[PDB]
Coordinates of C-alpha atoms and ligand atoms in Angstrom, one line a residue:
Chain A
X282 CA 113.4 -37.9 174.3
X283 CA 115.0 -40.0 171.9
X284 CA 111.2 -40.4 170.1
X285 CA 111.3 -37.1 170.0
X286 CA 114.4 -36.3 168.4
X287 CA 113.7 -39.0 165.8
X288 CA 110.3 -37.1 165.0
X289 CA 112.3 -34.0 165.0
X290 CA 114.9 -35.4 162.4
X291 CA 112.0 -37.0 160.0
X292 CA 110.4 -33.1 159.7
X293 CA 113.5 -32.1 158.8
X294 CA 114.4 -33.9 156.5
X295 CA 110.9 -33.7 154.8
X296 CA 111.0 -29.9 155.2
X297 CA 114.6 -30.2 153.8
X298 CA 113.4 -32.4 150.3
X299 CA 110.1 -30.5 149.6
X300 CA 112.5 -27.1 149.5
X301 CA 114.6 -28.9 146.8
X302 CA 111.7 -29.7 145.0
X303 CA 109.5 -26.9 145.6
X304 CA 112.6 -25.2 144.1
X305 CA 113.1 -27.2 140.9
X306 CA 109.7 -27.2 140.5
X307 CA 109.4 -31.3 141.0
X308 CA 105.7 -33.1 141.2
X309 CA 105.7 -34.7 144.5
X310 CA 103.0 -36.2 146.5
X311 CA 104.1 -37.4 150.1
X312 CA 101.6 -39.2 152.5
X313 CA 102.4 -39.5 156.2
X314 CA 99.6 -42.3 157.8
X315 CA 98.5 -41.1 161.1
X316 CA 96.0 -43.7 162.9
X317 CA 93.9 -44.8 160.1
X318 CA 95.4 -47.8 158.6
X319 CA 96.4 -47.2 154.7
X320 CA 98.2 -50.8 154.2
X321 CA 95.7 -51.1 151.1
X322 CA 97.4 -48.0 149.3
X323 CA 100.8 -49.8 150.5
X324 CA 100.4 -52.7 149.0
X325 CA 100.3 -50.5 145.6
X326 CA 103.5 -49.4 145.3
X327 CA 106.9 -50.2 145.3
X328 CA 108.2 -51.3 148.6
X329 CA 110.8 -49.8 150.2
X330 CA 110.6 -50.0 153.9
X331 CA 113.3 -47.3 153.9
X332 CA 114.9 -44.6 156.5
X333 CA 113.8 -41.3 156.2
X334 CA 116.7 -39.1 154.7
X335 CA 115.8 -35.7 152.6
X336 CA 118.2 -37.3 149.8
X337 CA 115.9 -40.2 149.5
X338 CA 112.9 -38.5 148.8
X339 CA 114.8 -36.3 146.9
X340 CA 115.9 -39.2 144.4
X341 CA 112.5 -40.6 144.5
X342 CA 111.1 -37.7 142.9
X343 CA 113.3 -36.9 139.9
X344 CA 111.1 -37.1 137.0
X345 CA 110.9 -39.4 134.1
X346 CA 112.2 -42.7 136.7
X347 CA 111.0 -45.8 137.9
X348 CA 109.4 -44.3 141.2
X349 CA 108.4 -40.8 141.0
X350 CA 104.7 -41.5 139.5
X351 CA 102.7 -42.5 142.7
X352 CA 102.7 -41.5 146.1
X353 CA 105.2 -41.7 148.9
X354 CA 103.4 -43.7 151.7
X355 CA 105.3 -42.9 155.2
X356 CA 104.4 -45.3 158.5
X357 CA 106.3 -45.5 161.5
X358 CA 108.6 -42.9 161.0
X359 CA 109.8 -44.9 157.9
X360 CA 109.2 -44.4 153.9
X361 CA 106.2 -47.8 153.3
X362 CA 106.6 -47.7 149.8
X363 CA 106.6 -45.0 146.5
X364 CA 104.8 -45.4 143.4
X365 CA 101.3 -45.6 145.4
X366 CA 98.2 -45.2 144.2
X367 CA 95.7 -42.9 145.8
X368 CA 92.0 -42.3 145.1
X369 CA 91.2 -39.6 143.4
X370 CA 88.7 -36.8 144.8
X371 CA 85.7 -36.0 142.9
X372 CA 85.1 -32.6 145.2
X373 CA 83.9 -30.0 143.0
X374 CA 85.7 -27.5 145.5
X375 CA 89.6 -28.0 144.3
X376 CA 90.8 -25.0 142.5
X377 CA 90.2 -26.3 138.8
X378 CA 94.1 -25.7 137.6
X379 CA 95.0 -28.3 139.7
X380 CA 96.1 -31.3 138.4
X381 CA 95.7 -35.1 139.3
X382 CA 98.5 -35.2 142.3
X383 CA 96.8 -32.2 144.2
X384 CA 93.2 -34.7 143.5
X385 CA 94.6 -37.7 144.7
X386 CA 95.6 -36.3 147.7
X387 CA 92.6 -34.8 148.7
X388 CA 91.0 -37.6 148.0
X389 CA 93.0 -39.8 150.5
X390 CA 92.5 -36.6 152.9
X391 CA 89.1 -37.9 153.1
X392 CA 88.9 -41.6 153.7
X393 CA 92.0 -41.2 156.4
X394 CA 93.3 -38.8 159.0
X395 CA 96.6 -38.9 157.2
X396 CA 98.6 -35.9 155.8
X397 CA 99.8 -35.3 152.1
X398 CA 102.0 -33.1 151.0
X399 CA 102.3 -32.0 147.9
X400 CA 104.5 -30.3 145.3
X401 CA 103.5 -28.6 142.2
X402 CA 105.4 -29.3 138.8
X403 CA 103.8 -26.3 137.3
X404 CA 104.9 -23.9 140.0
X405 CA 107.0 -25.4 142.2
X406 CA 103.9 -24.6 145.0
X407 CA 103.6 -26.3 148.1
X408 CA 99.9 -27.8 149.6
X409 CA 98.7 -30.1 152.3
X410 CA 95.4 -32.1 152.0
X411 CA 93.7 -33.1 155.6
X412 CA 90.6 -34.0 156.3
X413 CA 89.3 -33.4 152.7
X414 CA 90.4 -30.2 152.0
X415 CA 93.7 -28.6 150.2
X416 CA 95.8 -25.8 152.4
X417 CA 97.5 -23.7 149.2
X418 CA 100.9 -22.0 148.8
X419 CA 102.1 -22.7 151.7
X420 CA 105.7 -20.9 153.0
X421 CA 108.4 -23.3 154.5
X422 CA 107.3 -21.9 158.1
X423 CA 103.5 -22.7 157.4
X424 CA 104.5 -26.7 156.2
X425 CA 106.9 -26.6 159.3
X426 CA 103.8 -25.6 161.8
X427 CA 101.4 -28.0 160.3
X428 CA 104.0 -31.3 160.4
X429 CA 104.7 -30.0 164.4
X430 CA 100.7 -29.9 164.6
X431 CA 100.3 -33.0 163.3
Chain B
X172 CA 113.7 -72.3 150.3
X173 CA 111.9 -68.7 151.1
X174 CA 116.0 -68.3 151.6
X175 CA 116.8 -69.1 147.9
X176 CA 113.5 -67.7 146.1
X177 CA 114.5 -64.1 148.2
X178 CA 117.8 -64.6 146.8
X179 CA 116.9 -64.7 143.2
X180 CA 114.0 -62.3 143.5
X181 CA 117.0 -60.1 144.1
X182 CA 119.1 -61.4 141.4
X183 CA 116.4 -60.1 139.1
X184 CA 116.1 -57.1 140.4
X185 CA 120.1 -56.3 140.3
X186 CA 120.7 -57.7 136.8
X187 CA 117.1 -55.4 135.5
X188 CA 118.3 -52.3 137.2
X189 CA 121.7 -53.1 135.9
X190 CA 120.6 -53.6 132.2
X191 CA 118.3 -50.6 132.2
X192 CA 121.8 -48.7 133.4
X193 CA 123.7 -50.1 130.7
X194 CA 121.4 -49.2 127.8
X195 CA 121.3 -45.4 129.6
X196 CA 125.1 -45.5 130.0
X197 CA 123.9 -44.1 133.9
X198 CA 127.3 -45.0 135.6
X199 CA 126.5 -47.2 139.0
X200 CA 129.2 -48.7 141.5
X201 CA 127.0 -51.6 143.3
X202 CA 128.8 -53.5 146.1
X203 CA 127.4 -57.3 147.5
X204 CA 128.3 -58.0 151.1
X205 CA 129.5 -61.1 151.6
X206 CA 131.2 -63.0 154.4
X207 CA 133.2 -60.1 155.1
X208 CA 131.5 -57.2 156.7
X209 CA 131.6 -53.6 155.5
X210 CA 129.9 -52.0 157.7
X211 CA 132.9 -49.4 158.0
X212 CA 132.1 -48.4 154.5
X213 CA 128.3 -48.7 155.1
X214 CA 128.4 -46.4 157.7
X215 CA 130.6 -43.8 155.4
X216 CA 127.2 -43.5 153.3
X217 CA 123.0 -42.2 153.3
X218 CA 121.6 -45.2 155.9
X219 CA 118.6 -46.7 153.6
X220 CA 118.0 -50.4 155.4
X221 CA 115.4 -50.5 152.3
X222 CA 113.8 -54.0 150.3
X223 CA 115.9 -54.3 147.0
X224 CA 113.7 -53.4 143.3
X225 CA 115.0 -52.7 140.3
X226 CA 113.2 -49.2 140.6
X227 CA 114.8 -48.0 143.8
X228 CA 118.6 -49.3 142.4
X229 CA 118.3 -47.4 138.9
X230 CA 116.1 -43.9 141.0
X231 CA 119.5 -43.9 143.1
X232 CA 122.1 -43.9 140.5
X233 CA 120.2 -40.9 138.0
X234 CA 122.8 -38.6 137.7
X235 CA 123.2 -35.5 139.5
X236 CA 121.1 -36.8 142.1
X237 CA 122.1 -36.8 145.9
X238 CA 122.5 -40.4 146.0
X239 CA 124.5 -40.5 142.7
X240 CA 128.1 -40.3 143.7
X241 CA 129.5 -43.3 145.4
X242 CA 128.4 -46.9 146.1
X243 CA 125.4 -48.7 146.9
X244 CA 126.7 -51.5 149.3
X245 CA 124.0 -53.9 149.9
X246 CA 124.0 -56.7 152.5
X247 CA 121.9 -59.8 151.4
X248 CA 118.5 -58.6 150.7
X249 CA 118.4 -54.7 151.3
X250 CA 120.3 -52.2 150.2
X251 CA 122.0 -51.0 153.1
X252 CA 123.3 -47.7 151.9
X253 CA 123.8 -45.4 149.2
X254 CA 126.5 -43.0 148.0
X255 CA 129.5 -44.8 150.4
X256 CA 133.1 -44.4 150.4
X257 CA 135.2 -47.2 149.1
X258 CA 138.8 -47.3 149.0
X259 CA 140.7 -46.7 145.3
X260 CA 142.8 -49.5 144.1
X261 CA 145.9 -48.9 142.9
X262 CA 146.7 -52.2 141.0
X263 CA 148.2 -51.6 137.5
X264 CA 146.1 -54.0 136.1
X265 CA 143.5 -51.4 136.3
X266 CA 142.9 -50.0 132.7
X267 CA 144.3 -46.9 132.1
X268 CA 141.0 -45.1 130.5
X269 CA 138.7 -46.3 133.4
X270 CA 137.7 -43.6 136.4
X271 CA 137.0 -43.7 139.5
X272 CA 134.1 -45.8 140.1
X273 CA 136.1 -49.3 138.5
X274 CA 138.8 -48.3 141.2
X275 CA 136.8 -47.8 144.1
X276 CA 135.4 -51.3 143.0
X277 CA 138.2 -52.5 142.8
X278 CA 139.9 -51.3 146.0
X279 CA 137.3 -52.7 148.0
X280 CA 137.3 -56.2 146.8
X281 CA 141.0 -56.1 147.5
X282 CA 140.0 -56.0 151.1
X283 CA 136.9 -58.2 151.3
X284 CA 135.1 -61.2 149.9
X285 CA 132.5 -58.7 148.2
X286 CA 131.4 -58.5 144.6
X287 CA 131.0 -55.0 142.9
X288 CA 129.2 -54.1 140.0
X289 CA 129.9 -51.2 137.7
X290 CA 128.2 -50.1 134.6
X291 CA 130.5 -47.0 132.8
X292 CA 128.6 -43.7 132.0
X293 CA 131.3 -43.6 129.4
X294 CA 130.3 -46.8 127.0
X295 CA 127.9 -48.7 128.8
X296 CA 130.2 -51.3 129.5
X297 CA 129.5 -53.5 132.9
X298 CA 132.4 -55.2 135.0
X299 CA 132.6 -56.7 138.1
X300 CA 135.6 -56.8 140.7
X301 CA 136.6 -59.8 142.6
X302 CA 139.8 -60.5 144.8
X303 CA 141.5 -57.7 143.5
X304 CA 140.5 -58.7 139.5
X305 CA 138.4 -56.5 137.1
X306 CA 136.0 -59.0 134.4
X307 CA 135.3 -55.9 131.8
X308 CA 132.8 -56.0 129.1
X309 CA 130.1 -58.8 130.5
X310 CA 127.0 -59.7 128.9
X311 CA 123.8 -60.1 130.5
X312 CA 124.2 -64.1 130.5
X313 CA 127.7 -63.6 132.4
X314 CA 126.5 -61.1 135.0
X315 CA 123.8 -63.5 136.1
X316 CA 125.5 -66.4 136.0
X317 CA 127.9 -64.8 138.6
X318 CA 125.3 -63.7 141.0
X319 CA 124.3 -67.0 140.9
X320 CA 127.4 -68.8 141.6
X321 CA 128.4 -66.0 144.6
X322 CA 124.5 -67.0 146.6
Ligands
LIG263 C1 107.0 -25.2 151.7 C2 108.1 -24.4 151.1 C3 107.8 -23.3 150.4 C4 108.9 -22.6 149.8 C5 108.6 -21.3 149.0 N1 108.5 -21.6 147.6 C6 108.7 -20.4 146.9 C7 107.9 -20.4 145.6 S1 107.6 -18.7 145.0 C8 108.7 -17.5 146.0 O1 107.9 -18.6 143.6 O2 106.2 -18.3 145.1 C9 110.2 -23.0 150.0 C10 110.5 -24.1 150.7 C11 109.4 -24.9 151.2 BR1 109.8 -26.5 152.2
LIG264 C1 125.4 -57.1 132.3 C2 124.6 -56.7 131.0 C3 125.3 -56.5 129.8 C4 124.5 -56.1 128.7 C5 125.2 -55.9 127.4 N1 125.5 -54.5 127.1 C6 126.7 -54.4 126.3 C7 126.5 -53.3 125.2 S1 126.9 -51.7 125.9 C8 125.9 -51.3 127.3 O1 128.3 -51.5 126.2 O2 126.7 -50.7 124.8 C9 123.2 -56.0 128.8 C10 122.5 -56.2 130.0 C11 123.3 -56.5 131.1 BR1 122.4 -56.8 132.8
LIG265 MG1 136.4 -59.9 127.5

């Protein structure tokens, strides 16, 4: 269906970003709102209202510019805003190396249902935080399975 | 108006991504739809449909970025697209030293009512093409006061 070809496309093009920056070893932090509303972490950043494309999130990303600090907020297939602020996670349970992306996405995890992704600038690893808790080194197949799941 | 506070809210966001460019020497080709319609050449580049800021304008042009190469065409309010073909001018008034960007900008407002920005990645310098003409070496005060007079 064409809703499902346009879900198909969005995955792809995450899939297709977080390898570049997985690669190059780019922070990232990429927040997809499911049914809990996250309008108030919105209104934080930037707004973009933008259509999904790998190269966009790409660009977003590159270090040292306007937008890369913050998180990407995605709703309705579309990229909300970057730059967002997330709360932070005071779980004693994140592996302590872990830096204040990874804790702002777990911390998100647990006041919505929503997905974050996230990409490591010290290693170029890739994690997902749900539900409160942080899914580690994840291959391209694993991210691929969770963003069908979801 | 809500019409003419948009309008300058994106003024001001052009002329600070535009400044910030400058000072970087981060080349940028940025094209204003006007009355003339382009979405030919829209639909040549990355579909964005996104709210102007001066972030998202100066996080495209960084170089060696996938949105780098090629113009931004943006059409009233939201930038439209990013990396877009434009047609090269071939006018001799053209100056000799300049690349490709000032000719792409030039070579498509020789076919539309549009107004292109460009800053250089070689000095820093920013020029706008009009109706076939390159203006070379504006200041801040100039650049505004032509987006000004074009809303
Ligand atoms: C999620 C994902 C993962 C990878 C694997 N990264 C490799 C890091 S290594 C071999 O140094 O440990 C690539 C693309 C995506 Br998309
Ligand atoms: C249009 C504009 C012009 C300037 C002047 N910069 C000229 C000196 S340079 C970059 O060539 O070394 C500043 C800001 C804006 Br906005
Ligand atoms: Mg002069």
């Amino acid at each position: 269906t064409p809703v499902e070809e346009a879900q198909q496309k969005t995955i792809e093009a995450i899939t297709k970003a977080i390898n570049y920056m997985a690669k190059r070893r780019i922070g990232a932090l990429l927040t997809i709102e499911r049914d809990t509303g996250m309008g108030d972490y919105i209104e934080t950043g930037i707004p973009l209202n933008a259509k999904v494309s790998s190269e966009l999130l790409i660009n977003i990303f590159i270090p040292n510019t306007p937008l890369h600090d913050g998180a990407v907020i995605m709703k309705n297939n579309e990229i909300a805003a970057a730059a967002c602020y997330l709360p932070l996670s005071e779980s004693p349970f994140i592996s302590k190396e872990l830096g204040t992306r990874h804790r702002a996405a777990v911390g998100i995890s647990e006041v919505t249902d929503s997905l974050t992704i996230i990409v490591s600038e010290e290693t170029g690893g890739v994690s997902v935080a749900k539900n409160g808790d942080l899914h580690r080194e994840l291959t391209e197949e694993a991210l691929k399975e969770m963003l069908e799941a979801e």
